[PDB]
Amino acid sequence: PEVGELIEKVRKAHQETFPALCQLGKYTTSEQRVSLDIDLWDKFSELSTKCIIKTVEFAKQLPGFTTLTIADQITLLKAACLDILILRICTRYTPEQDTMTFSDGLTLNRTQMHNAGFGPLTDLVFAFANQLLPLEMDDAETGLLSAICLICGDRQDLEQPDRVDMLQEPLLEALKVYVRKRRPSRPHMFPKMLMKITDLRSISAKGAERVITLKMEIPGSMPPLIQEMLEN
C-alpha cells in the first residue's frame, strides 16, 4: 500500500545513485600482491569519493531523511558511509571472474582490488561479497538494506535518536514483506539478509582502521567531505 510506494521510492533512489552490474559496460587496467599500487589507489580513491557523493544523494532521496536535524543527517552519514560503500561494491561482484566492478565500469580482480587499497581486508571483503550471492538481492533490497543501515538510531551523538528509530521502522517492514513476497517458501531470508548488517559492521570497523593507516602513508589522502557536502 503505502509500503509499496516506500519500496518503489527506495529502489529508485538506489537505482539512480548506483547503476546495476548487469548494465555496466566494463573495462580494465602480469601482476601479483604488493603492499599498494599508488596508481590503482588513485583511481580507487577517486571512484570512492564519487560514490560517497552518490551515497549522500541517495540518503537525501530517502523519505524523511532530510527532515532530520542537519547534525543528525551528518552523523548518520559519517557513521554509515564505509558500510554502504562496502555493501555497494560487493553487489558488483562477478564470481566466475572473481572481480568487482565500479560505477564507471572499472573492473578489478582480487589482486588488483588488493593492490588498490583493500590490502589485508581483501579476502575479507571478497568473502562477504560471496555470502551475498545466495540472497540474490535486487535493487530494492540493496537500497532498503542500505537505508536500514544508514538510518540507524544507535549511532552516538544523535540529537533525536527516537526520530531516527521512527524513520527506520517502515524500512524494516517494507524489507520484510518485499523479501518474503519474492521468496515465498524461504521466510528465513528476511532475518538472514538483515543480519548481514552485522557482518558489514565488522568489516567497516577494520576498514576504518586501514583508512587511518592509508591517510598516513599517503599525503592528503581522503579529505573529509560529508560534513561540508551536506551543509551546502
Partner: protein
C-alpha cells in the same frame, strides 16, 4: 511446528538455569569468569546444541562467549542506572569504567544495548533467543558442518518471530527491532577483545582450551 523445532520455553529454561579485592578490573574479571564457568551448562540446554559434533560446539562457543556474556549482563542491567550489574551482584558505574580505560565500551553498552532492551522491554525469552542466534554462528571458522549450524540458527529465527507474533501482536516489527541488537552486540563485542590484554580471564588459561575441558567432561 516452528516452536516444535526450537522450543522457546526450552531456551528460556537455559537462560534461567544459568541465571546468576574490589576494583573495576577485578570485578569484571571475576564476573566474566563466573559466567564463563557456566556457559557450557547454558549452551548444553539449548535445543539440539549437544547433538552437534563436539569439535564444532567448542568452535561456536569460543566465537561468541564475549557477545553471550555482554548480552546477559546488558539485559540484567535494565533495572539499574548509569551502570552495569555484574553476575557477581556488583554494580559498576560508568565512572568506574572510565577509570579502567573501558569507559567508551561501557557508554556504548549502556546506550546501544541496556537502554534499548529496557526501552522495548525485551523479555527474558527474547534475550535468550538472541543469545541462541549468537550461539549458532554459521560463519565461525573451522566449522565441520556449517549448514547444520545455520539451519539451527534459522530455526531460532523461526521460533523467535513466532513468539513475538504470539505475545506481542500489536508489534509487527518487534522481531526486527529485536534482531537489530545483534549488530551492535558484535561491534561492542569486538571492541571488548582489544581489552583482554588488561582483563585476564580464567587465570589466563587459553579460552578454547578451557572450553574444551568443560565440554569433554
Amino acid at each position: 511446528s516452528a516452536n516444535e523445532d526450537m522450543p522457546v520455553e526450552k531456551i528460556l529454561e537455559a537462560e534461567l538455569a544459568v541465571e546468576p579485592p574490589n576494583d573495576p578490573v577485578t570485578n569484571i574479571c571475576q564476573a566474566a569468569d563466573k559466567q564463563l564457568f557456566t556457559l557450557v551448562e547454558w549452551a548444553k540446554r539449548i535445543p539440539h546444541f549437544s547433538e552437534l559434533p563436539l569439535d564444532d560446539q567448542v568452535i561456536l562457543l569460543r566465537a561468541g562467549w564475549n557477545e553471550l556474556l555482554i548480552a546477559s549482563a546488558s539485559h540484567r542491567s535494565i533495572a539499574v542506572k548509569d551502570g552495569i550489574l555484574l553476575a557477581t551482584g556488583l554494580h559498576v558505574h560508568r565512572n568506574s569504567a572510565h577509570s579502567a580505560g573501558v569507559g567508551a565500551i561501557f557508554d556504548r553498552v549502556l546506550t546501544e544495548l541496556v537502554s534499548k532492551m529496557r526501552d522495548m522491554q525485551m523479555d527474558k525469552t527474547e534475550l535468550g533467543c538472541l543469545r541462541a542466534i549468537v550461539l549458532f554462528n554459521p560463519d565461525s571458522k573451522g566449522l565441520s558442518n556449517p549448514a547444520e549450524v545455520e539451519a539451527l540458527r534459522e530455526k531460532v529465527y523461526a521460533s523467535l518471530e513466532a513468539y513475538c507474533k504470539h505475545k506481542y501482536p500489536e508489534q509487527p516489527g518487534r522481531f526486527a527491532k529485536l534482531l537489530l541488537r545483534l549488530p551492535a552486540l558484535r561491534s561492542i563485542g569486538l571492541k571488548c577483545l582489544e581489552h583482554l590484554f588488561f582483563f585476564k580471564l580464567i587465570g589466563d588459561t587459553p579460552i578454547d582450551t578451557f572450553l574444551m575441558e568443560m565440554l569433554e567432561a
